[PDB]
Structure formats: C-alpha cells, structure tokens
Amino acid sequence: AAAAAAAAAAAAAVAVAVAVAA
Amino acid sequence: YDDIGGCRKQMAQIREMVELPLRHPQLFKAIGIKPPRGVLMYGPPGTGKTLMARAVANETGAFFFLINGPEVMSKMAGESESNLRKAFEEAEKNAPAIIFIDEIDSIAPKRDKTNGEVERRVVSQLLTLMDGMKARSNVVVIAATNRPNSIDPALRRFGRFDREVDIGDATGRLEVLRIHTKNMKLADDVDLEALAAETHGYVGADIASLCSEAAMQQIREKMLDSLGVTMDNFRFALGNSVNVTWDDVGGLDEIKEELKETVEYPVLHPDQYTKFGLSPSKGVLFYGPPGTGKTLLAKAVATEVSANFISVKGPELLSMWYGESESNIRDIFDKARAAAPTVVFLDELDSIAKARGGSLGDAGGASDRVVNQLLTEMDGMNAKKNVFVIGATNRPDQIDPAILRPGRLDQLIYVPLPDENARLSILNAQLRKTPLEPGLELTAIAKATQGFSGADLLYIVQRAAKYAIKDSIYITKEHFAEAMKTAKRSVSDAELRRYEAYSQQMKAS
Amino acid sequence: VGYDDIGGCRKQMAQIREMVELPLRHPQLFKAIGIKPPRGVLMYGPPGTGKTLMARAVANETGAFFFLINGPEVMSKMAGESESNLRKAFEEAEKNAPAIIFIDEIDSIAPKRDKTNGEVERRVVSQLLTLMDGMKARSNVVVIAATNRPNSIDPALRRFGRFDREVDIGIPDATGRLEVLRIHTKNMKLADDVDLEALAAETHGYVGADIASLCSEAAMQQIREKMDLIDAEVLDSLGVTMDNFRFALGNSNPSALRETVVESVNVTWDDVGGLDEIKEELKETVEYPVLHPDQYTKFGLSPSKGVLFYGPPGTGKTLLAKAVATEVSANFISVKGPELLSMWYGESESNIRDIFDKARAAAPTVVFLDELDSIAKARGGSLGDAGGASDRVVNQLLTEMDGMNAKKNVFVIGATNRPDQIDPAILRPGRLDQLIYVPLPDENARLSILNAQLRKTPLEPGLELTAIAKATQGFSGADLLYIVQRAAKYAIKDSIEAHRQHEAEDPVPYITKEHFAEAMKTAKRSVSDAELRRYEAYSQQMKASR
Amino acid sequence: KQMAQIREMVELPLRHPQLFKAIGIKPPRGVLMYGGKTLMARAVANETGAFFFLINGPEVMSKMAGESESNLRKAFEEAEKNAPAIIFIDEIDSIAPKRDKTNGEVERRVVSQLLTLMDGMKARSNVVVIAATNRPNSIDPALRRFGRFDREVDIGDATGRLEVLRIHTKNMKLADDVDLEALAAETHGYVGADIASLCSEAAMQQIREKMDVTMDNFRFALGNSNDEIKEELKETVEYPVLHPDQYTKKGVLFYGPTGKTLLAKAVATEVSANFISVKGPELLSMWYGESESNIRDIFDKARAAAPTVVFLDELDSIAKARGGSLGDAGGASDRVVNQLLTEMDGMNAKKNVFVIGATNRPDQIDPAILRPGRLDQLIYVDENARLSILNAQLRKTPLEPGLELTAIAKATQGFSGADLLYIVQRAAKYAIKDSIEEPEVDPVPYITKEHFAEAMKTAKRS
Numbered sequence A: 001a002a003a004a005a006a007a008a009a010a011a012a013a014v015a016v017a018v019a020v021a022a
Numbered sequence B: 001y002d003d004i005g006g007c008r009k010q011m012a013q014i015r016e017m018v019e020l021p022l023r024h025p026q027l028f029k030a031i032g033i034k035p036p037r038g039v040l041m042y043g044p045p046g047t048g049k050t051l052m053a054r055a056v057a058n059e060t061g062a063f064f065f066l067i068n069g070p071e072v073m074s075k076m077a078g079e080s081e082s083n084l085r086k087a088f089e090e091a092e093k094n095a096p097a098i099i100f101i102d103e104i105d106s107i108a109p110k111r112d113k114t115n116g117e118v119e120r121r122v123v124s125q126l127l128t129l130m131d132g133m134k135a136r137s138n139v140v141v142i143a144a145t146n147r148p149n150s151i152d153p154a155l156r157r158f159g160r161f162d163r164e165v166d167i168g169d170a171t172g173r174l175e176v177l178r179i180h181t182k183n184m185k186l187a188d189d190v191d192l193e194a195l196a197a198e199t200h201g202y203v204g205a206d207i208a209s210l211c212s213e214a215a216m217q218q219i220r221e222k223m224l225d226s227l228g229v230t231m232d233n234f235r236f237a238l239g240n241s242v243n244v245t246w247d248d249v250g251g252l253d254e255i256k257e258e259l260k261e262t263v264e265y266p267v268l269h270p271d272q273y274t275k276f277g278l279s280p281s282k283g284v285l286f287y288g289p290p291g292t293g294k295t296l297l298a299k300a301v302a303t304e305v306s307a308n309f310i311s312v313k314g315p316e317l318l319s320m321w322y323g324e325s326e327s328n329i330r331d332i333f334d335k336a337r338a339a340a341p342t343v344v345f346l347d348e349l350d351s352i353a354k355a356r357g358g359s360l361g362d363a364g365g366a367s368d369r370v371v372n373q374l375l376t377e378m379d380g381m382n383a384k385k386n387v388f389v390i391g392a393t394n395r396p397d398q399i400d401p402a403i404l405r406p407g408r409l410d411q412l413i414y415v416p417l418p419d420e421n422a423r424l425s426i427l428n429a430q431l432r433k434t435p436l437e438p439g440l441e442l443t444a445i446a447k448a449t450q451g452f453s454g455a456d457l458l459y460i461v462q463r464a465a466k467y468a469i470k471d472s473i474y475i476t477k478e479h480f481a482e483a484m485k486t487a488k489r490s491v492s493d494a495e496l497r498r499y500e501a502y503s504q505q506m507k508a509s
Numbered sequence C: 001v002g003y004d005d006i007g008g009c010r011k012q013m014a015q016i017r018e019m020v021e022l023p024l025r026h027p028q029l030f031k032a033i034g035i036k037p038p039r040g041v042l043m044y045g046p047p048g049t050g051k052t053l054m055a056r057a058v059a060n061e062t063g064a065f066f067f068l069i070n071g072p073e074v075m076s077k078m079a080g081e082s083e084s085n086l087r088k089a090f091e092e093a094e095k096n097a098p099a100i101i102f103i104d105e106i107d108s109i110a111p112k113r114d115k116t117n118g119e120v121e122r123r124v125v126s127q128l129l130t131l132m133d134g135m136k137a138r139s140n141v142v143v144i145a146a147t148n149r150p151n152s153i154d155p156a157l158r159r160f161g162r163f164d165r166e167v168d169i170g171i172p173d174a175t176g177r178l179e180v181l182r183i184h185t186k187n188m189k190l191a192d193d194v195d196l197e198a199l200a201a202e203t204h205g206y207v208g209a210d211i212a213s214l215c216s217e218a219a220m221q222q223i224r225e226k227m228d229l230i231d232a233e234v235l236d237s238l239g240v241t242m243d244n245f246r247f248a249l250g251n252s253n254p255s256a257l258r259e260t261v262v263e264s265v266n267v268t269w270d271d272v273g274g275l276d277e278i279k280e281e282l283k284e285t286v287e288y289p290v291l292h293p294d295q296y297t298k299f300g301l302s303p304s305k306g307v308l309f310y311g312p313p314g315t316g317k318t319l320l321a322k323a324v325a326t327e328v329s330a331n332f333i334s335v336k337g338p339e340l341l342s343m344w345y346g347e348s349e350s351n352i353r354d355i356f357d358k359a360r361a362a363a364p365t366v367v368f369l370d371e372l373d374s375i376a377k378a379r380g381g382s383l384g385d386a387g388g389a390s391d392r393v394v395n396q397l398l399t400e401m402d403g404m405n406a407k408k409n410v411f412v413i414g415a416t417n418r419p420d421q422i423d424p425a426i427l428r429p430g431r432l433d434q435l436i437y438v439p440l441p442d443e444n445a446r447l448s449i450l451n452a453q454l455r456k457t458p459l460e461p462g463l464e465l466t467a468i469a470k471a472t473q474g475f476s477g478a479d480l481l482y483i484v485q486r487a488a489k490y491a492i493k494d495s496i497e498a499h500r501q502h503e504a505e506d507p508v509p510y511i512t513k514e515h516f517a518e519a520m521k522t523a524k525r526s527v528s529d530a531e532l533r534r535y536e537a538y539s540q541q542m543k544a545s546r
Numbered sequence D: 001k002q003m004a005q006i007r008e009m010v011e012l013p014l015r016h017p018q019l020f021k022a023i024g025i026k027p028p029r030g031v032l033m034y035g036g037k038t039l040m041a042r043a044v045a046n047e048t049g050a051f052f053f054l055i056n057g058p059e060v061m062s063k064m065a066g067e068s069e070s071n072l073r074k075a076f077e078e079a080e081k082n083a084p085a086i087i088f089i090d091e092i093d094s095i096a097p098k099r100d101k102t103n104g105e106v107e108r109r110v111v112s113q114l115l116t117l118m119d120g121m122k123a124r125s126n127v128v129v130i131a132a133t134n135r136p137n138s139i140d141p142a143l144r145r146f147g148r149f150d151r152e153v154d155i156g157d158a159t160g161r162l163e164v165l166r167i168h169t170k171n172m173k174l175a176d177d178v179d180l181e182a183l184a185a186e187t188h189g190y191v192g193a194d195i196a197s198l199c200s201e202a203a204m205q206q207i208r209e210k211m212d213v214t215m216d217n218f219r220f221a222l223g224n225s226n227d228e229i230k231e232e233l234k235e236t237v238e239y240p241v242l243h244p245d246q247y248t249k250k251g252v253l254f255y256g257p258t259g260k261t262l263l264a265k266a267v268a269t270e271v272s273a274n275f276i277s278v279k280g281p282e283l284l285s286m287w288y289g290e291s292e293s294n295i296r297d298i299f300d301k302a303r304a305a306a307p308t309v310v311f312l313d314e315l316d317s318i319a320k321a322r323g324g325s326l327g328d329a330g331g332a333s334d335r336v337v338n339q340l341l342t343e344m345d346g347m348n349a350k351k352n353v354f355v356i357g358a359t360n361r362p363d364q365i366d367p368a369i370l371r372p373g374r375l376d377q378l379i380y381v382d383e384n385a386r387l388s389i390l391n392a393q394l395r396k397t398p399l400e401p402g403l404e405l406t407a408i409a410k411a412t413q414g415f416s417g418a419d420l421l422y423i424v425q426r427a428a429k430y431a432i433k434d435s436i437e438e439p440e441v442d443p444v445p446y447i448t449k450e451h452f453a454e455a456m457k458t459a460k461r462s
C-alpha cells in the first residue's frame, strides 16, 4: 500500500524601512 | 592555457598553485607545509574567470563541477543545504577535483543585512563544509563574484578563500583576438591593431561574440575557397564612445598641443617616467564663455588614447537624500579608476564646488560634504594610478581655493573666443564629408561673424543642411546667403569682459 | 591535533580543560564537595581564533565519546524531522559512555524566537531547550557550542543548565602570537637568520589562521623564488629566509581588517621635507606607547591618543598620514570625509561604531579621520535636517572616542582645512589632544622639500636648488611639486625630440638649469593672502589661549 | 520575410555545412518562435528528408526518477546519431518555468539537463533546434543566452488560412455555392483552432436551420464569433522615417487655444508606427533617482521598439523652465529637465524616435528645450473644425433628424473639443432624465433641440 506525507517549509515576507532626507 | 589572454600573472599564479600540489606533492612534503585551498575570483562580469578555471581543470586530471548561485537556492527548508552537501560529497567521493561555485555574493548576505533564515543557513553550511573536522581532503574550491565586499568575513578567511585574485589591457585584448580567431582563416590584409585599439571597453567575453557576429555576417552577406571576414565585417560588428579624431576641433593650436602633450606623454612612455622617477600632472581646468568647445576639446583629447570616457554633468549628481551625492561621486571615481587609463570630464564646477565657505543651512552642508568628497577622491588616500580629471566651467570665481591647488586642477587653461582664422578651421572641420560647391567662399562667411561661437556655426551649418534637404525633397551658395541673416549670437558682451578680467587676474597672480 | 597544537590562549584552555576532564577523571572530589559540575560551554569570539581546533583537540585527547553536530545539517523540509534528528543525536550520545556533544555554528539553528517568522526554527529552538533542560535532562553528557554572534541567540538558551559559562576565545597578545608562530613553524625547515620574536612583535591584529596564512605564504614565496631560479639535491637546499617572512608580512593584513585594507602607497619619513619638529613629535606620540608600554605602566598613566593637523591646503598633512601608514607598526584605517554617511535612518552612526569597533578590536590601530569638516561640523546647526543627522553623527563620534570604553591604544589622526568650523567638544583633550598647525614652509623648509622630492632622479653634478628654494618665498609643497613636474615634462619633451631626430637621421640623461628656468617662469602661488590671514588669525588666537 | 528568414536558417546550415565551416562561424543552432508556428514547423518537417524527433513540453516526465534527463539525453543522442537534423520542442514554457518563480527540484534538474545538452553540441553534430512558445516573457535568460537561442522570429496569412480552410472543411457535404476565398479574406486574426470553431459553428447553425452548410451559415458563424496642417504633419512624419539616402546625400511641438490631443490620437491610430504616451506629471517622484529612472526606462522602452512616437502631453508641467526656484521642487525640476535633455540629445539618426509635445501655455516651456537640435518645430493650431468635431462626436448617436449643428458652431467661437464633449454629455444627461421621468420602446428615442438648448445653458469655455 502507498502512503502520503505532509510538508510545510516557509513563505516570503515584506519589510518596511525608513529613510532620511536633506 | 592557449585560449587565455591578458590574465598572464594571475593565470600563472593559479596554474602553479594548482599544479604544484598535483605534479609533485614531494616538494610540499619536503618543505613541510600545506598549500592554499581557496581562490576567490572577483571582477566585472564577462572577464573570463570560469574559462580559466575550466582550463586549469582540463589541463590537469581533475573534475570540474559547476555550482550556480541562484540555482542551488530554493524555498524548501533544508534542501539547498542538502544540495550543497550532496555536491561536496560528490566532489570528494571520486577524485581530487576543482569546485567552481559561481556568483557567491547572492548566497552570502553577510548574515546581518538579510532577513531570510535559509540564506544564513546556507552560509553556515558553506562555512561548515569548507572548514571543520575532516572538512576537506585534497580538494580546492574556486569562487566568482562582482562585488567582493558583500561576502562574510569568516568566508574571506584563511582556509576557505585565503587568496583573492583581481581579474580586471591592449596587449591582452590583442592576445584574446589572436586566440579567438585561431581556427579560421579571416584574410591577409586584416590588421588587429585597430581592432585592439578601437574596442577599448571590451571585457573579454564580448570579443568572442564580436568575432562570431562578424563571421556570421560575412557568410550572411555572401549567400568554400576564398572565404573569411574582412575589415568591413569587423566594422559592421563594432557598429552592431565618441566619434572624433583630432580633426573636429578648430583653432586653439597651442591648447591642442598642450593637451596632446600632457595626455599622450604619460601613456606612451611610462618607462621614461620611471627612469626620471616622477609622476605626471593630471588636472586640466577650462573656463570662459559657453559654446566655445570645451566638451569637444575633451572628446578630442580623449579619442586618441586607449582610455575610456566618463562625462558627467554638474547638477545631475545632487540629491535630496543624505549621502546620495557623495555616493554617486565615489561611484564615478571608482568606475574611473577601475579601468586604467580613463579621462574624467566634470562639467559645471561652479555648480558643484560653489566655493563652499559658509552657508549655514542644509544645502550648504550638503555642498560642503560634496566638496570634501570630491577633494578626498581627487587627491586623498588614493594611488592615482591613471586618472585624468578635466574640469569645464563658466564661472571660475565660485571655486574654492582647494580644487585649484596643484595636484588636482593645476592647469588653469583659459579658452578664449575664436577668431576668423580659427573659424575657418572650424568651418573646414564641420564640413568634412559634405558635397561642396566650387563657388562658395567660407572666408567671406567667416569674416562677417565678429564674435560668434561654435554653437552658432553649427546652427548655421544645420540651417544650410535643412535648406539643402528642402531643395532636394551639392550645397548651394544661396542657402548660406539666406542662413547668414538669421544668426543668433547667444553670448553677450559683459560675460566676455568678466572672463577677460578673470584671465588677467590669473595672469597677474 | 592535541592540546599542544592549540596555543595562544591559556585561560580559556584551562577553563574548558578542567570541566571536560576532571569530572571524568576524578569524580571523588565532586562527590566529596556535594555539587555537580557545570555541563555546558558556549565558545564565542571573532572568526578564525581556534574554537573548532580546541574542540577537535579535546575530542582527540579525552577518552570519552565525541559526537559532532553541524548547524544546518539537521534541518529538513518535512514537518517534525529536524527535531527527530536532534532527538536521535542526543539519545545516541547518551546511550553510550559519558560523551561530548559539539553544536558547531549554533547561531544558525537557534535565533531569537520572537524575531523569526517561520515555524520549524521555533520548534527546533524549543527542542534544544527541552533537550538540554527538562525532566531527566542529562546524565554524564557534556554539551559544547561555537558561535560568532552571541547576541543573536535566544536569551532562554544563555542560562545556567544549558550553557553555564560563555568563554571568550578572543585575539591573542604578543606572547600568544609568539607561541602561535612557534607552533606553526615546527614542521617546516627554517633558516637560522629569521627570529620569530621580532615577527610576533611586528604582527598586532593577526589571529590564528592569519598566522597560518602568513607561514603558508612565506613558504610559497620561498618555493616560488627558488623554483624559478632552478630548472633530489634541491630538497636539501630548502630553507625559508627572513626575507620571505618579511615579504609575506608586508603583503598581508589581519582578516578582520582585510576589507578595509588601503591601496599600498610608497612614502617614507625622508620623502617628506621640512616639518622636522612635527614629524618627531608625531613619531614620539605614536611609537612610544606601542614599543615601550613597560614605562607607561610603571608611571601609571595613559598616553595621548588624538592629533589634529590644520593649515593651508596641500602643505603635507595627508602626506604625513601616508608616511605614518607606511612607517608605523600599528594597523591603519583610512576614511574619506563623508564616506561613512548614508541615506537611511541610524546607519551613519552604525558605520562609525563598526569602524571604531574593528579598530579597537585589532589594536593598536591608527584611525585617520580625513576632512573632519564634513563629519564634525558644529553641533547645533540651523534646525531641522540641517542638523538632524549631523548632530547624531557627532554625538556617536564623541561617545565612541571618549566614554564607557576600555583604553586600547586607538590613535585618531585628524586633517582639516577650516578648523574654526569644528565642534569644540571634539577638540577637547582626551579626544584630540594635539592641535598641530602645519604652516607654509620657509626658505630652508622649501629647500628640504625640494631635496626630498628630487631624491630619486638624475641631476646634473653642478646643479644647486638654493636659488629655486629662495626664489619663491610664498609657495607650498604642492607648488614645488608643480615646478618639478613642469621641469620634468620639458626635459622629457627634449628627450623625445632628440630621440625622434636621431631616428629620422641617452641624449639628455639629466634635467638642466635651462629646463628649470624655462619651467619656473609660469608659477602659481596658489594659496591666497586672505586664506593666510585667516590661518594666521586662528593660530594667534590659539597661541593667545595658550 | 519571416518565412524567408526561417527557410535560410534551416537550409543554409543544413545543406551546406562545409561552407559554414569554411566561413568559420558555428553559432546558428537554435531558433525561437514567439508571437502558424506549428504550421511552419510541420512545413519544415515535411520539406526535408532529415530526421524529426518532435518532443512537446510536458511529455518529458515519467514515474521513474531521473527519466526526464534520460529522455532528454536519448532524444539528443538520437538526433546526433541519425543525421544532421532538426529538433522541435513545442511549448517550452512548461519545461522552462523561468527558474525564479518555481519551487520544485525536478524542474530545475530538467532545465539544467536541457542547458548542458544544448551547450554540448560540437561541429560534427550539425543539428539545429526549433522551439515554439506562446508568451515571450516566461523564458529563462540562461536559455536565451549566447550559444543556445539568439535568433528568434516574431511571427505577427490569407493563403495559409485558405489552406487550413480547405484542409478542415473538405470532409463534409458542404454546399454548391461557396467561395472560400472570401472566408479566407474576411477572416483576419484567426489561427489554427478558430477556423475549426468557425466550421463547427457553421455546422451547428445549419443543424439549427434544418430542425425547426450554405454560405450564409458560415457568414453569420463568422459574424457571431471572434487640412493643410494635418497634411504637412503627416507628410513630414512620413519623410523623416522614410529612406535616409536622400538625407544622407526629431521632434515637434503643438501650441494654441482645438484638437491637439485629438491630432495626437489620430497620429497614434493611423500612422502605421508604434506609439507610447505619458501624461505631464505622470513621470514624477519625490525621490532622487526614481523620477529620473522613469524617464530613463521610458526612453529605453522607446529606443527598444524603434520606430515609435513619444507623445509628451502638457510639456510645461514637466519642464517649467528650470531657471531658479531654490527648493526641493526646484531641484526635482532641474533634475527632470537635465534627464530629459541628456536622454533626448543622445538620439542619432539610428533608432528614429520622435517626441510630440502639446501645451496650452507656451510661455512656461523651457527655452533650453525649445533650442535647435533637440526640438525645433512649432505647429500653431475654428468654425469648420468645430462643426467637424460636433459631427465626429455625434457619430454613434440617435440624433433627432430635425436638428442642425451649424447654430452651435456659430454661437460657440472660442470653445474647445473637451467642452463640446461636455455639452453633448449634458444633452445626453438631460435626455436620460427625460426618458427616466403603452408608449414605444423609448418615449424620447432621439435627442431633441430642447435638450441641446437646455444643455448649452451651463456651458463655459476651457
């Protein structure tokens, strides 16, 4: 008989940065 | 090894550092030390680094295994590290081989600027596979990158990447042309000197594509005896960075002679300068009225040497952010000194320098920081290998007395307004390839100028060409007779008196 | 590799040695005193100091079972497999006799839980926590770790019972480097002339693998110079001279500073003319603390660190910086003026603190802050972004140069052109002690400058430079360099003319009096009289304060 | 032209290998087909007696692990073993998933196998590869690198459509009064399958006719399936982009109170050239680089698709005569003007781009952009044009028959096309209000004169 298997690795996120003007 | 050109010293160093372990390990047994087992190759993309690695792996009984940067990386956790471990186990099972990991800067994000866990995990996997308990058993790894500063400091350590090779000239380019045209009879009257002097900015990977495109275009235009490419095929391949040669500029004979001397002498005779033991001058500064030919003079003095040309503008570098203008200045000087020789053309020095002094504001502090970055990049803690900074402004009174210091912009060359004998040469240089009439007199056109500029003469020539193409849809005399009335004379009189006063003050100093 | 192979760090070696060996050798003492020994170590420090080497040494010497765990090797993609790998490793280790476990590069496995987005990393962190601490946690099993970023570890992991003590395996001292050289140079055949003590004294920031690289490079240089000279008996004549080691040392640099290496420029103390008093004062200030620390500790005082050169442009301050970088033993860190700045928020200060951290780590070091007019300015500007970052950068400079740090022989060398615009807190003693004014050279100083510039070049035997030196009275070293350049250009133009004429049909192997006379008729005198007035006013104000 | 190009590329490297070797060029080996690609592949396979191992995209996977790489090696060694031949790889977008958006591992392995098998072809192989694709964007640049695929064709006809019709519809009891030339002529954009759907719907409509295939069935199966200023402007545009031999032996500006954007639309429709248009402040960004990177990559897209027309609408808003403003907006304006000048003055006789400008106020445009050598033309832009605008706006409109627009043309003097559209839209709004406020299908089917006389009450000038 056959069998299944589960797998959950990761994803991709988004960051936000702050800048300084002059 | 017969298919590598220009990378002579580094090819010989890599060849000896690979083959001295491989030809005889008894020498390293007698000297009682271990050879280095890491080569970090860095430089511009398209140089020939992986070709040398493949040549060393082919001339010696190794096994060239290629690992790519973005290929091995995946989104599954613990799979890219498993791929790296499988590749290292495959390289260590069969034989002493040569590992070429390409584009290592993508999988080395320095573990502090990145956010992904998989990148730090594969960085730790590379540091574990390269060094550790029974890490490597007679196997050397080779890398390849464009910016070697974005690598981990534990990766640039001894035992992993203990050797850093800078693979960044005309004789090497001619050697690449000779080794890339070896398996084909091109012709009998093809001279490789023009092909090695005109392609001054080819990295090495474009020369093979150039010869392949020429050999394809010759067979394309000729569709087995007496086959091969000619000079026009190479001209079409080069056609598929300015086009002047000491002829488009008119007048200014002593200025042309001085620029020709102070540019061609440090290029043609380095051995005589090492015999004299002195460094030549670098900076030339032009000033005067606009529309005079400073950019054309810079292009005409850049076009005869085998140098590049980086022409940047005044207000095209200032930014509203903090540090962006100085980063652009540093990038321009790094791209200038990364390819020797190279003449740099800074325009609008009155807009860049502003004679920093004191402004008490954000724009004043940004101007001070730009001026200090330029003063550090021109003559600071550098090597000044081959950098020819040429300035061109129209307001020399707004320059601080630190860029006019000798060593930076010592040549205070004034570019005056041309005369009729100079306008004759300008009109003869602009009408080089033009069908002319025997009845036109360029002397009668040049006598009635009385203070015109090169831009006005180009406008007159363009109006004459527009009237010629209007009559078509040789050049006749009535086109010049109807275009001489609509002159411009964009330069006024007070700027000429101010420039003459500045020149007299510079002469009296 | 045994314990003898590891060297340069004695305290840490004892710390791991006693814990790993004595409980496994004589547990009677622990039974008598009624306290169990610590069973966890986290070795940290900069890369390439010998952490893995010490782990290998203790593994190879102790009779206890050794199990090796790598960082990413245990991770997987399936749900619940990395933890299974760790459980298998720990249970296999505990099944046998008392054993040692080594989790190399633990910082990859176990980052801070709160600041991660995945889930498998959190589960494996929790698995490590439960394995080391928990119900019936460990029995005669010792755990050792190695990392480079201790702060990027879960704080729950840095507790007693998991990693009892964090030993700092840092860079060695002069003696430590001496033992490192002696250890590495034990198998290769050496020549009698070279003495490793001088080399150990000369090297300052080299750590471990850096010395290994030095030895390997010296051996390779010796082989390469002999292999090219010659086409069994060759093996006998295999000896590495002091010159080979000198070559390797000159061509090398410590790993931590390799990215900050400066392009080599050849300048020497004789290449800078005039300024003898300033040159001697700088030499004293620099080589006194580094060559003779015994006297300083005997007198119980710290040495002056900072220096600031100010004056007209071109007079030779950057030349003195080059001369120092060439002719001092301490490491050099050059920086342009605004080179450290950045558009982002809180990054220009991070830049400053990183460079200072590297400098004080690889001590002694000379940091050359060039063009302080940009970084320093004057705190309290014209409000808004005109000062918003220019004040934060200055405050970071102040607190890094002086305050809440350990004195570790870091000499800041300044160079400015309008020092009146510098923040007064920077000029304070203890930050920039010396305020040196580098004036325009006088007649004799100009003569010295000319002789220095004309050191290596053919000269006519009956040629004197006193007239040239005296006929300026207002010039600077840059202007004299310009005069020399024009004279050389005219001489080489004459040489090319003669060569061309000879080809058409050494003519001039020296520069001539007429060459100098023709070149000198167009001189500059770049420094204006208003700048001189300003500099004189500032200097006399300083003297009045003095 | 594309058929002649592919015939040369499949004949000259396949019939005269010796001549190619003598020349010394060994690059031709890969041809790409983006955009009758399968029809050209079948014609190539049926015009040569060489071997033809067709391999489609997703037909390379098998239950056995590693079969994909073994199948690729088997096909490549069979094509190298048999004869100098041609391989057809249809639908390459399944095998090459662009390597960045994918997450599998056997796709990366089969892409690496295809890369190392396409590169491992020597001079004695003498085999070429042909590949067809649907989208020209989802391809690996490592597959488009120099060495494998460099010579792509852009197949963007009536004879092949008549051939496909005579192939498909010849297996039915068709008609006696059919002319398939008209069906091949009137069908313009169909390809391959749409003609088969046309014949199937013709059969379905014939069955629907004889339940409750002649020419009318195919007919409605096709129908139910899927002055001197403009003269000088057109002539001048045609002449500049025409052959340059006469010239050997770019820009324009509109200004006025009238149809300038209408004239730019008429250029964009009926010039037989490409067209790219942006608004005035559309390309702005309060950042150093971005607001210049937009113009940089706009001109890169312009020079890539040569020839083209870059219609810069509302030039004043962009240029603003940089002059002196002394601020962040002044610095952004100066950087925008410098980017525009340094990315327009670098246009040689090659790449033949053409910038079209339009404005209301010509005072505030920069004289640095009105200079000769960059943009020198000045086209100055009435009652008859107003009548033509009112008649072109009311084309697809059920107008009242008893209505004249000459009164609206004579009453409105200094108006413009936008406010004429506003007048027509207000008339339509009033008619819709009257309609919303047994009769016929519409109680007010046409717009009366009262709706126009009430819509012109609140009409202004622009």
Ligand SMILES: Nc1ncnc2c1ncn2[C@@H]1O[C@H](COP(=O)(O)OP(=O)(O)O)[C@@H](O)[C@H]1O
Pocket (backbone or CB within 6 Å): B003, B004, B005, B006, B007, B045, B046, B047, B048, B049, B050, B051, B052, B176, B179, B180, B204, B205, B206, B208
């Ligand atoms: N020194 C050289 N001599 C001959 N050919 C060279 C040289 N450098 C580059 N090439 C050519 O450039 C092409 C690309 O170089 P290669 O080293 O394979 O990759 P890369 O583009 O990464 O530098 C090769 O096909 C090779 O023929």
Ligand SMILES: Nc1ncnc2c1ncn2[C@@H]1O[C@H](COP(=O)(O)OP(=O)(O)O)[C@@H](O)[C@H]1O
Pocket (backbone or CB within 6 Å): B248, B249, B250, B251, B289, B290, B291, B292, B293, B294, B295, B296, B392, B418, B425, B426, B427, B429, B430, B453, B454, B455, B456, B458
């Ligand atoms: N001596 C000259 N001979 C020929 N053309 C000239 C000469 N001087 C100027 N010109 C023309 O005048 C123009 C001047 O443009 P540019 O060099 O950008 O400006 P500027 O002279 O203000 O630096 C050039 O395009 C060039 O064709």
Ligand SMILES: [Mg+2]
Pocket (backbone or CB within 6 Å): B131, B132, C051, C052, C053, C146
């Ligand atoms: Mg280690």
Ligand SMILES: [Mg+2]
Pocket (backbone or CB within 6 Å): B379, B380, C314, C317, C318, C319
């Ligand atoms: Mg200096």
